[PDB]
Amino acid sequence: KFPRVKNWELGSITYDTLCAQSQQDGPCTPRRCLGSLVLPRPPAEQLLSQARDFINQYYSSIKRSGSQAHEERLQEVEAEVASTGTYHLRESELVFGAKQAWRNAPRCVGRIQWGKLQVFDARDCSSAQEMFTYICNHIKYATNRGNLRSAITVFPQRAPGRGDFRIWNSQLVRYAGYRQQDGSVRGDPANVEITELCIQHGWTPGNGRFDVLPLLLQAPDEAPELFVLPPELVLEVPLEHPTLEWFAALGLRWYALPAVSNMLLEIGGLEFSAAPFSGWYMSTEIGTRNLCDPHRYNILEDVAVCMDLDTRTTSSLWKDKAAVEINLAVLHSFQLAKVTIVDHHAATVSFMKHLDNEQKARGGCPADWAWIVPPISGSLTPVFHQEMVNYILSPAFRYQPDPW
Amino acid sequence: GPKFPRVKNWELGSITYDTLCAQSQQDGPCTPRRCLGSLVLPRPPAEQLLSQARDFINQYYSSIKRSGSQAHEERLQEVEAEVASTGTYHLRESELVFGAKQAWRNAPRCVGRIQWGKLQVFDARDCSSAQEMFTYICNHIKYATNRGNLRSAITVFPQRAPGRGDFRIWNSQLVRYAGYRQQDGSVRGDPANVEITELCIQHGWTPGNGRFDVLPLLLQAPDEAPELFVLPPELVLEVPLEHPTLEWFAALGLRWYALPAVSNMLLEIGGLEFSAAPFSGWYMSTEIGTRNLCDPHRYNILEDVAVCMDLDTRTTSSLWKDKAAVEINLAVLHSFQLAKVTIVDHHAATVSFMKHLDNEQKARGGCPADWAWIVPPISGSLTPVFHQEMVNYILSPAFRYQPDPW
Numbered sequence: 159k160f161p162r163v164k165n166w167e168l169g170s171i172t173y174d175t176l177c178a179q180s181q182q183d184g185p186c187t188p189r190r191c192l193g194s195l196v197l198p199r200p201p202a203e204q205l206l207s208q209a210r211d212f213i214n215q216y217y218s219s220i221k222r223s224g225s226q227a228h229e230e231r232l233q234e235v236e237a238e239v240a241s242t243g244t245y246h247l248r249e250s251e252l253v254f255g256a257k258q259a260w261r262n263a264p265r266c267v268g269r270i271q272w273g274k275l276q277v278f279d280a281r282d283c284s285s286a287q288e289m290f291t292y293i294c295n296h297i298k299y300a301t302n303r304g305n306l307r308s309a310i311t312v313f314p315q316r317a318p319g320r321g322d323f324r325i326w327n328s329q330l331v332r333y334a335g336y337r338q339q340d341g342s343v344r345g346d347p348a349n350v351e352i353t354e355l356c357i358q359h360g361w362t363p364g365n366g367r368f369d370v371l372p373l374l375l376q377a378p379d380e381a382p383e384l385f386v387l388p389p390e391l392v393l394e395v396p397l398e399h400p401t402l403e404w405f406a407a408l409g410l411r412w413y414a415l416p417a418v419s420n421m422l423l424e425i426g427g428l429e430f431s432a433a434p435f436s437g438w439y440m441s442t443e444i445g446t447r448n449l450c451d452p453h454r455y456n457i458l459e460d461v462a463v464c465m466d467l468d469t470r471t472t473s474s475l476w477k478d479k480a481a482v483e484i485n486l487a488v489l490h491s492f493q494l495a496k497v498t499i500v501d502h503h504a505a506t507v508s509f510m511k512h513l514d515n516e517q518k519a520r521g522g523c524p525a526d527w528a529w530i531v532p533p534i535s536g537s538l539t540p541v542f543h544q545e546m547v548n549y550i551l552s553p554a555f556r557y558q559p560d561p562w
Numbered sequence: 563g564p565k566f567p568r569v570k571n572w573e574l575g576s577i578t579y580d581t582l583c584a585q586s587q588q589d590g591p592c593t594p595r596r597c598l599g600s601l602v603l604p605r606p607p608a609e610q611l612l613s614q615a616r617d618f619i620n621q622y623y624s625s626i627k628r629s630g631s632q633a634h635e636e637r638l639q640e641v642e643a644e645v646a647s648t649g650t651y652h653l654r655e656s657e658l659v660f661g662a663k664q665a666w667r668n669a670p671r672c673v674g675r676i677q678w679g680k681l682q683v684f685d686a687r688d689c690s691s692a693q694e695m696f697t698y699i700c701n702h703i704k705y706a707t708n709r710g711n712l713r714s715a716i717t718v719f720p721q722r723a724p725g726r727g728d729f730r731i732w733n734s735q736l737v738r739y740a741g742y743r744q745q746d747g748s749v750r751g752d753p754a755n756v757e758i759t760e761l762c763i764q765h766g767w768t769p770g771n772g773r774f775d776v777l778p779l780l781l782q783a784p785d786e787a788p789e790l791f792v793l794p795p796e797l798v799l800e801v802p803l804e805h806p807t808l809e810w811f812a813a814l815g816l817r818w819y820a821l822p823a824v825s826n827m828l829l830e831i832g833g834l835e836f837s838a839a840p841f842s843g844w845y846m847s848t849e850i851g852t853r854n855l856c857d858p859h860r861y862n863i864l865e866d867v868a869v870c871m872d873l874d875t876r877t878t879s880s881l882w883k884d885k886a887a888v889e890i891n892l893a894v895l896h897s898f899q900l901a902k903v904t905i906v907d908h909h910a911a912t913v914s915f916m917k918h919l920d921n922e923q924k925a926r927g928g929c930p931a932d933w934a935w936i937v938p939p940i941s942g943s944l945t946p947v948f949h950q951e952m953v954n955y956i957l958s959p960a961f962r963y964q965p966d967p968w
């Protein structure tokens with residue numbers, strides 16, 4: 159019926175009634191739970207109902223529900239869909255839908271911010287070089303000289319028979335992954351495949367550990383085009399430790415803008431295949447996952463040895479000790495270069511709050527517990543002790559197959 | 563591709579398919595709509611019992627590789643017969659030892675299952691008094707503690723009988739510290755155990771007033787109220803905590819006992835229900851160092867230790883919490899090793915769980931696991947299980963949560 163959600167630190171309890179608004183289905187069934195899985199796997203009347211629904215959400219949003227503008231706007235969709243098999247959104251609606259899609263992202267812990275979102279309408283894009291410009295402006299704006307501002311740029315919606323506008327990169331900014339001689343990897347290992355694809359389309363490789371990749375933009379039914387980002391637009395932070403003078407000597411650095419760009423944005427039945435978004439980092443994304451994942455830059459042991467720790471046995475907790483300093487380094491550095499960042503403590507505190515604001519406003523909030531809880535010190539944060547319910551609401555950000 | 567859940571390990575990029583989940587008879591709390599996987603708690607007539615038992619029986623004979631044999635089909639007859647003429651039935655010695663290990667083996671929340679086949683099953687289905695219950699438990703503790711070289715073990719008391727009252731152990735663990743509710747509102751000792759401390763007092767226990775007073779046991783024989791027994795201190799091995807380099811840590815006077823013994827879980831085998839069947843293994847350092855000692859609603863010693871470390875607990879970005887939490891855990895590890903009591907850190911522990919997964923994959927086609935519970939309270943993505951996806955589902959035999967007997 160309705161799930162009972164309990165917080166074991168405060169002993170408080172709520173009842174998620176929002177989950178009932180879930181139209182789309184998840185991986186789990188009563189026989190078994192697959193919530194820890196990272197990845198998973200729409201005709202005439204389906205669209206119309208998704209559209210009506212979203213238009214209803216829109217007008218309830220501005221309070222002018224069931225009014226005239228609503229009834230008429232509902233006729234516009236009906237008419238357009240019935241004649242062309244599809245329809246279009248209006249700037250204001252698109253702005254509402256985007257914000258909604260972010261508000262419903264179950265894996266996002268920065269949703270307390272869902273209200274302030276700079277929505278750029280790039281639906282009038284007709285070429286990869288045009289895409290490049292939009293993408294470049296997003297960056298200038300979002301970055302704001304280290305004073306980050308969450309933004310999104312929405313490109314032409316998908317269309318039957320025509321190919322999808324796509325940004326081939328995972329994020330607008332990433333470091334190359336050069337699979338070398340001995341099967342080893344120089345740079346960021348999660349970017350080997352994409353770094354090759356760029357070379358293959360005529361990119362002159364590099365030889366560093368932090369070579370900022372070029373963007374492959376794709377306009378409908380046309381092979382992808384290569385564009386280089388103006389070194390100036392791409393802000394970066396040099397990592398140095400507060401008390402460890404020797405840290406900086408590691409040359410570690412990381413870009414300031416986190417901007418996923420391969421996710422599909424779905425609103426009122428429409429699918430936007432290229433709609434990059436960015437807010438700001440949570441220290442642990444850089445210091446824990448990006449730099450300490452064994453299959454990433456995996457610098458855990460180096461910093462360990464540098465700290466003269468006992469890498470001999472696990473029980474010395476060298477890994478833990480080293481991981482904490484690496485995160486501290488990030489927080490210090492970013493805070494030194496006056497670039498927006500939020501540690502996992504402050505961040506989870508705010509999400510905890512967001513769950514409260516949401517409990518009041520919608521009777522619940524979708525959350526993926528395994529993703530909301532930081533990669534280090536989970537139990538030390540309020541979120542670890544909070545039960546969560548996870549379901550799919552729309553508007554929504556979804557995953558989509560790579561364009562190759 | 564294969565028509566079973568596809569599981570990926572993102573560190574190694576390897577894949578497997580869980581074909582074992584197909585054996586799950588009991589449905590969980592999730593639905594194709596919403597996932598209730600992060601929740602800790604979410605909630606059998608004659609004819610239904612028979613089928614549960616036939617299932618177990620088949621399971622038994624297969625473990626001894628004799629499915630379809632004479633003993634097997636002759637044993638199934640026996641079970642039907644007995645249930646038919648009495649409404650219930652009994653397990654043979656080795657059938658009990660087999661279910662008890664399958665219960666552990668199936669336990670989706672235990673990261674220590676690699677040891678599943680090494681469990682020591684003490685039968686106690688002959689026990690008939692609360693007093694005797696105390697004797698059994700004392701032996702268990704003595705054997706399991708074994709002076710520090712801990713040994714997996716479980717004592718099984720009489721199974722639920724129609725009408726008659728259950729055998730129960732009121733405490734949540736054979737060994738727990740007292741939770742003294744003060745006047746100002748605070749709690750001296752372990753808040754987790756406030757209710758059980760009040761239940762022991764209401765029953766005649768003369769409380770102390772320490773931060774670590776070992777609770778006495780409230781044992782319950784069928785239909786009788788619970789008798790109150792006090793564990794002899796000599797039996798309850800404990801470990802005083804101290805840091806390997808922070809000389810002042812030993813000054814906090816923090817201590818923890820060596821034996822983790824859950825005792826209020828119902829052990830269910832082939833339909834039968836064993837309301838009192840305490841089991842114990844040994845600690846994973848994070849249980850003490852991060853949960854019991856650092857949780858906000860527990861001892862809550864994070865601020866204290868942070869202050870001792872001269873940390874800036876005024877701002878979060880200083881990571882004072884992450885800093886102290888680490889030293890505390892290290893102190894749990896160090897002190898245990900020093901005192902030669904068995905313990906396993908979250909690194910070794912999780913690594914051994916990956917091995918268990920690889921093993922069980924080849925033996926049964928999968929392994930039911932609760933991600934949120936397998937992944938450690940700290941340093942999560944530094945341990946390999948974080949990077950391992952996993953399927954969760956209920957298999958039987960099993961350990962189930964059960965309502966408090968009051």
Ligand code: HEM
Pocket residue numbers: 256260263265266267268269271275308309310418435436437438439440443500505529555
């Ligand atoms: C304002 C700052 C924000 C913070 C601190 C924040 C933080 C996070 C974090 C840490 C994650 C998980 C990251 C990972 O492990 O890959 C996440 C996921 C996500 N966030 Fe946010 N976020 C913010 C803004 C945004 C914005 C502007 C959007 C979209 C409009 C957004 C959409 C999402 C989505 C869709 C995911 C899930 C991505 C996936 O499934 O891989 N976030 N966010």
Ligand code: HEM
Pocket residue numbers: 662666669671672673674675677681714715716824827841842843844845846849906935961
């Ligand atoms: C021998 C070493 C063992 C280790 C290191 C180990 C470790 C763990 C850990 C870390 C937990 C989670 C504790 C928590 O977060 O509350 C756990 C849960 C569990 N373990 Fe083990 N365990 C061991 C032995 C046993 C034994 C012998 C049994 C049973 C015969 C067992 C049954 C379970 C069960 C049922 C749970 C989950 C209980 C619940 O849901 O609250 N474990 N174990």
Ligand SMILES: N=C(NCCC[C@H](N)C(=O)N[C@H]1CN[C@H](C(N)=O)C1)N[N+](=O)[O-]
Pocket residue numbers: 196268328416417418435436437438439440443
């Ligand atoms: N704070 C963030 N963080 C999102 C950063 C993305 C993350 N660092 C990343 O590399 N994402 C990849 C890898 N894992 C995701 C997946 N589902 O596989 C995509 N977002 N924002 O817009 O402000």
Ligand SMILES: N=C(NCCC[C@H](N)C(=O)N[C@H]1CN[C@H](C(N)=O)C1)N[N+](=O)[O-]
Pocket residue numbers: 602734822823824841842843844845846849
């Ligand atoms: N190592 C253990 N550990 C068991 C850990 C018990 C844990 N310290 C505890 O107090 N468990 C309670 C509180 N939370 C669980 C629940 N479901 O509410 C039970 N078991 N063993 O047999 O060796």
Ligand SMILES: C[C@H](O)[C@H](O)[C@H]1CNc2nc(N)[nH]c(=O)c2N1
Pocket residue numbers: 194195196528529530572948949950951952
């Ligand atoms: C297998 C498991 O689902 C996977 O490793 C998840 C766990 N939690 C995560 N949490 C966040 N924020 N980001 C991730 O990429 C992951 N990976």
Ligand SMILES: C[C@H](O)[C@H](O)[C@H]1CNc2nc(N)[nH]c(=O)c2N1
Pocket residue numbers: 166542543544545546600601602934935936
């Ligand atoms: C709310 C959430 O389910 C709860 O805090 C869980 C998370 N993971 C856990 N994992 C383990 N091993 N033990 C616990 O007690 C918990 N508590």
Ligand SMILES: [Zn+2]
Pocket residue numbers: 186190191192193592596597598599
């Ligand atoms: Zn689930």
